[PDB]
Structures are given as C-alpha cells and as structure tokens.
Symmetry: C6
Subunit: 191 residues, 6 copies
C-alpha cells in the first residue's frame, strides 16, 4: 500500500476511478510517468512532484537522497487513456508515500487539481467521479472545498456511504490519506 493511491479523474471510459502507483528505486534523479497519460495529466504529475520537492524538509525527505533515486509514476490499466488535472492531489500523495515508505490508508480516494502553492483546486465531473467511487467500495473520498456546492445533486445514499472530506490544502490531504503524520514531529502537551 506504499505508493498506491486511488484517484478520481478522466478516462476514455468516463470520469472513472484511477489506481495510481509510484516507485522510488536506486537511480540518478530521473522521473518517469506512464499509463497512457495525456499532457495535462503529465503536467499535473510535474506540479505534484514540485510540491513535494519544495516541502521536502517538512516531509523529512533529504534532497541528497532524492538525487540518488529514480521515480516512476504508473497508472494501470496501461492501455486506457487518462487525462485532466483531477489526480494532482492523488499524484502528490503517492509521491510523498513512495519517498517516505509511508503506506497510503486504504478505502481512501481523492480528486482535486493541485497548485504549486499547495492549494487544492475545484474539479469537474464530481458526480461521475463519485458514482465511480461508490461502485468501488471506497468509503473516504477527499474532494476540493469549492466542490462542496456540487454535492447537493449527489444521491443521499452515496453521501451517507462515502465519508467525504472537503479539502482546501495539500497539507490536510496527506494527513487524511497517510498512515503516519507526514508533516512535523509529534509534540505532546498537557494542560
């Protein structure tokens, strides 16, 4: 479950469900991405990686470990075309995981366009993506805050089933999706 995230984004078989895989192996700092990915989705991976790279210290990733590793983002089924910016936060979560050996919580799906500032941006086809996550057995679905309005025409059943967390920042997403806390050392205070 390390480096495996369920994203909701566009496929040629509809705004279906994505299984995103990442690997971090010995190398020289090369990035590879595969899975019949359109250009917009490829650019989203680049944006997600950069988000990771800038937040490195805070994520505990040494830049001088990152440079002796190669990264491969892969999205099966490999023959099915996928595109759009909606897996950006899925991409970023998967990248953080594979770089940190921090397993991704299961029954968790996410959709959202990522920015370099760590802001999660509204996406399209919320309904379809959630029909997708429903027929998938996913409980927790992370969606962008500005998509909250779009919920009103999602069947209560779907809503009652899905533990839905609207999210504004990448910071919340990682905490919701990762086993351990990705950011900052645990400091315990008592009153």
């Amino acid at each position: 479950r390390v480096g495996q995230v369920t994203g909701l984004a566009w496929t040629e078989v509809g705004g279906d469900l994505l299984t995103i895989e990442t690997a971090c192996v010995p190398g020289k700092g090369k990035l590879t991405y595969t899975g019949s990915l359109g250009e917009v989705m490829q650019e989203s991976i680049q944006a997600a990686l950069t988000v990771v790279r800038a937040r490195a210290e805070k994520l505990g990733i040494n830049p001088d470990f990152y440079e002796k590793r190669d990264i491969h983002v892969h999205v099966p089924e490999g023959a099915t075309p996928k595109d759009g910016p909606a897996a950006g936060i899925a991409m970023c979560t998967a990248l953080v995981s594979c770089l940190t050996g921090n397993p991704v919580r299961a029954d968790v799906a996410m959709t959202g366009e990522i920015t370099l500032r760590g802001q999660v941006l509204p996406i399209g086809g919320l309904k379809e993506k959630l029909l997708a996550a429903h027929r998938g057995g996913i409980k927790t679905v992370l969606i962008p805050f500005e998509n909250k309005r779009d919920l009103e025409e999602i069947p209560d059943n779907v809503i009652a089933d899905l533990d839905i967390h609207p999210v504004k920042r990448i910071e919340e997403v990682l905490t919701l999706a990762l086993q351990n806390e990705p950011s900052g050392m645990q400091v315990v205070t008592a009153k």
Copy 2:
C-alpha cells in the same frame, strides 16, 4: 511569494492568471506547465534571462541557475493560455521566488517583457482590466504605451482601478513587491 496575478490571453479570452513559481535544489532545469502556448513559454525564457542578467543587483546569487531547478506553473492546468502579456508577471514571480520577497496580492500586472527589461504594450486591454476589476484587483500595472487604450474601457471600471503605466521592469518590481529590491 512566488505568486503573481497576471493578465493574459486564455482560450476564453483575456483573464486573471495566477502565475506560480518554485525554486528547489537541482542542477539548472527550468520546467513550465499549465497548457501554455509557445509564445507564452518563450516569455518565460525571456523573463528568466532578465532576472539572470540583473541577478547580482537584485540580491540573487548569480550562480543560482546551476544548483537550483525552477518550475513556472499557471493554473488551471487544463485551460489553454498564450501570448506574451504575462511576461512582466513571469519576471516579478521569478524575482520573488528567488529572493523570498512577498508579492502584494492586491496587484495585477500585464505587459510584454524584453531582455533589456522594457515593458512593451499588449493587446485586448479592455478584457484584461474587465477581468482584473471583476476579480477585485485594486491596483493594475500596465505598459506605458497602453495608456491611450484606457479611454475605450468603461470609466466606472477605470475609476475603481489604481492604474500604474510602466516603462521598465525595475518600476514593476518596486510597485509589485513588498520590500525594496
């Protein structure tokens, strides 16, 4: 920091762009993303050269581009964008990212940049300001030579805007950045 509100052409017309820049440990790679057309990609290259040429004067380490990677990104990722009007915005975002000097988030800017750092006039001035106005921008930087073009835009819109016509990049920086580079 590393964020600038620019005004440029998008598939649906002149609009607000949030230009993002990040600067991380690397070996001199620049990446630019956001469904950018080729003319816009080139303005990014010109803006970076402006920053590189004026590097030492701006506080920046003139050897920065051999040890760091730069990503310029313009959301939203799927919306096509093009033209050279983001140029001074590109430059300001780069300076900001490389110095850590916050950008005033009440300021939008539009204009083509040259390697000499002069601000060239742009097209579709009406759409850009109408966009800036609807988005609640308080202060807008426009090319000096677009001054004439203001009179074709609703007075009620111009009256709401603090408009600074500019000739040179050093003016843009001083007006948009928080501190004094």
Copy 3:
C-alpha cells in the same frame, strides 16, 4: 541472456512472441526495440521498475543499473506489436537476464504487470492460447482474473495445454525460472 515466450497482440501473424533482454557494460541506459507501440513500450518500463524495486530480494545488486545498459528486444523485428500483455514475460526475462537463472523453454506467459507486482487480466485469451498451442508450448501462465475466459477455449487446446492462472509476479517467477 534473457528469453521468454510471451503471448501479446501483433498486427499480423501469431500473438506468440519471444521477449529478449540483454544486460551489458554501460552507463544505465534503457533501449527497447521490435516495432513496439507506445503501450508495449511503457509495459517494459513498468516491468523494469518492478525488478529494480526488488533487486535485493531477487538476489541482484541494487545498484546494478549504475554500470549496466539494458536492451529489451521483441522479434520478429518488423512485426508491429502493442498492448501490455507481455508485461510479465518482460519482467521474467529481466530477472533471468540479471540473475543468470534460465527460463523454461516449454513455458509461455501472458499478463499485464503492475508496479506492485500484481498480474492484470488481458484481452484476446483465445487467440493467445491458439498461438501457444500451434507453437508447441507445454505450459501457459495466464492472469487469475482471466480464469473465466478459459470457458470459451477449445477443449483440445485445454487438453493439450498446462494452464497456470497467476495473480502476482512471485508465482510467475517460481513457475518460469529453472
């Protein structure tokens, strides 16, 4: 070096292919050839990444790829080929190439591989097993989730062939490697 009988889509002729891998002194380059469409090219990258993530368990020096170049080739050279169905063959071949452990010549295999090492189901099982049968292959490895598809394969083909439905790459390698 590495050779595995894969079953995968081709524009012409049989869907039965020999996946070949070579590992030679180099600087860490990857080369893949054989009139490969883009999906099949990506499946090579996936397969390699699988092996690289398990080099230790597989008994391969984790930093092997530093001083080594890899060439993956899929004859016949001029026959257009594509699709992900050669994934597990490519992975098996690469392991064979890097360990020196030979692959059984009476075994064919077909399946799409994931980075996690799972074996995904493929299309055209019938045409694939016919190529395998016509080609004299004794044992055929197929995705577990293609189990239901066997229902529509000729009983003689079913009678003549030893079919092992598989789920993960560990099974493939155990069955295929000598």
Copy 4:
C-alpha cells in the same frame, strides 16, 4: 544586453526589428526566442560562430563561451519572423554584448552573414527601407549586392537615407558600433 535595429522579414512583411542579445553566467548554452522560423534560427547560429571564430581579434576572452549562456531574443514575441536578413544585426549585437561596445541608435542594418564574415544580398529591400524610413532611421547598412535594388525604391525615401553598402562584417561593426573595435 546588446540591441541592434535589424530589418528582416516578419509575417506582416519586411520590417524594423529590435535584436536583443544577453550574455549571462552559464555553461555554453544558446537560447533563441521571438517566434523565429528555422532559417532565422540558423542565422543566429552562423552569427555566433562568426564571433566565436574571431574572439581574440575582437578582444573577447576566447573561452568566454565556457562559463556563459547566450540568449538571443527578437521582440515582439508574438510576431513570427524568419529569413536570414537579420544575420549581420545578430552578429553586431553579439559583438556589442560580449565587448561592451554600445550600438549606435541612428543605424539599422540588413543582410545575410556567412561564416567567413561576408555579407550576402537579401530580398524585399523596398519594404525594409520604407520601414527604416517610417521609423525615423537615419543610417542604413545594406549588402553591397543590393545596391541596384535601390533604383526601384522611391527616390524621396532613398534621398532621406544615409545608405552604406557593405561586403564584410568588419565594415558593419565599424559603422554600427559606437567605439572603434
């Protein structure tokens, strides 16, 4: 940043162009932008090699291109440009940039450059010279072999112009650079 007024082909037709060059710290990289077609791109390369081969004679550090990058840019970024007619401007701009010898602003120039530093004739001289004239250019450098082409250009335009027919890049540099190289 070296600036030279070139006359060269654009999508609107032969026109006055500002050629910009920047030499900044780098590792020998060449960048060229400004919606340039391939033939113009190749002229930049020919131009640079001319300078590179004549480095010491021009008083340039012969290994300058080892620790430095070059960006040649021709605004306006959006207007397509092509053809070889900016070659001598490119070469002049690079020489100006690498030596700090500022270019005269009363001078425009047009002509194809070769590696041996010969200036070859170009087409559309009429359009080019009318463009220099409308833009208030006093002095225009043209290839020696374009001399006869002057006769089909209105006399009233040519009488206003100080025209210098040139054969070699050394002539170009002497006439166009402020200080004697």
Copy 5:
C-alpha cells in the same frame, strides 16, 4: 577501423546488395547510423551491436571497448531508402570485423534477421535477394536455416552458381564470413 560486409536486404526498389560499413573511432560510447535507413533497419543495428556487446569476451573484445569508442554504421547509397531486418547478420559481422580487426571474405554475401540471443530468423523475398547476389558476382551467400524451403523457387542455374550456406546462429555466420577464427 572500417568494417565492410555485403548484405542482402530491402530497398525502395526491392531486395538488393548493400555494402554495410561500420566505423569504430576514438569516442565516448555514441552510436550513429545513416544511409536513409527506416526504423526497422535502425532497430536491427541496435540489436546487432547489443549481440556484439553481450558476446565481447567470447570474441576476444575488451568488454569495456564501448566506453571509449564511438561507432558509426553507414549504408550507401546515401539517398536510397532502405528498411527491414534482413541486414542484421551483416551488421553484426561488420561490427565484429571492425572491433577485432578480422577482415571479411570479399566473395561472401549474407541476409538474415538477427536476435539478441544470436539466432538467425528467416526473411522474405529470398529469390529477389539471391538473384542480386548472382548478378553482383557473389559466390557465397549465407541465408537463414528456415529459408531452406524457399530455395526450391530459385532458378536452377542461380542455385548451381551460388554456394548457399543455411545458418541457425550468429557463431556460424562469423566462422563462415570472417577470414580468421572468431
């Protein structure tokens, strides 16, 4: 430094005699290939070089030869489009010849698709290829073992003039084509 082998392979105007040239000069490990070559034929050159690299030790070649050499494979005539895999064993032979200083027999031609494991695969258009061999005065032609069936279709007089050697593997090709023992 320049290996030379006669291959029989496909050109725009049909299967033909090709002179395959290979150069190994002071370099850093680059591979260059030219001669209006289509992609399949470009791929056969990469396959043929890989065969040599994998077998360098057995060929008496320093296994690190490529780290300090550049290779250029060129197939004249420059303007004639050529494609397909039939020049593969010729490419391998030229590369081995060049790298080991083992000259190539001049009356020999060869056609055959090479594989990384070094097996020679059958090609098409044997008759067209063999006649070009015959016209060009070639005495010896190496052909793939599985092309034996196609010999029945070749005019009897061409069969009688040509010394035809059906080969299964690259070692046979090299033994038959190189002046010295591989």
Copy 6:
C-alpha cells in the same frame, strides 16, 4: 581554409555550393546549417567519420572531437539543399579547417563519400558542370563512374573545364588542398 566549392542538388536546381566550416574552442558539438535535407546532413556525418578514422595520418590531434566544436554551414541560408553529392566537399572542408591546410581556389568537386573513402557517382552531372562553369570554376573533381555522363555535356563547357574523374578521397585531398 574551411571553404570548399561543392556541386550538389538545390531546390533552385543542381547548383554550385559554397561549403563553409569553422573549428572553434568548445566541447565536441557538431553544428550543421543551411536548410540542409536529411540526406545531406547524413553525408556530413559520414564525411566527419572519414576524417576521424584517418585523423592521426592527416596530422590531426585525434582528440579534437572532444576539445573543439565544428560548424558546417552552407549559404545561402534560405535555399533548401539535399542529396549526397556534397560528401567529398564536406570531407575536404573538414580536413582543411582541422589542419589549417588551405583549399585551392577554382576547384569544385561533386561526389558521394563512403566511410571507406570511396567516391560514388552522383546525378545531374550536366546541370552541375554548367553551374561550375558560370561560377568561373577551372578544375572540377567528379566520381569515376560519372565519366559516361560527360558524353551529354556541351563541347565548350567541357573544353573550358579541367575535369578529374576520381575513385578515392585521397586523390580528392591531393587535387583540392595546397
């Protein structure tokens, strides 16, 4: 030095070409410009390999490949040029810029070069010789197998030219360099 007159196909017709070369302080980059078609670009790569394979004997430091950048440019820049006919000129220009050995004036040459250094026959010899004539060329080097094509060339053109049928690159360097 580094300037050779070649005869090769252009979009305006088989024409006279001024091949230019410069060898500059650098790191081993090859640049070739002049709106050159791929076949003509490939002839440049072939010509360079010939020089590289013979560097020592040509009094060229064999490590020039690593310490110098070479730019091959064929004006006029906007005129498309293609085909293999400039090969021997390319080789000659290259030897010249690397050796400082000047190229004779009033020499033009046409011919496809091979890596072994053989000169191969070209097409359009007649349009090529007519071009050499009007450009005021005295001596013209042609491939040996193009001798037969001389029997289509006007009497005066032939009378005016000193034509040398050549088999090999070393006759070329001999007849063309000082």
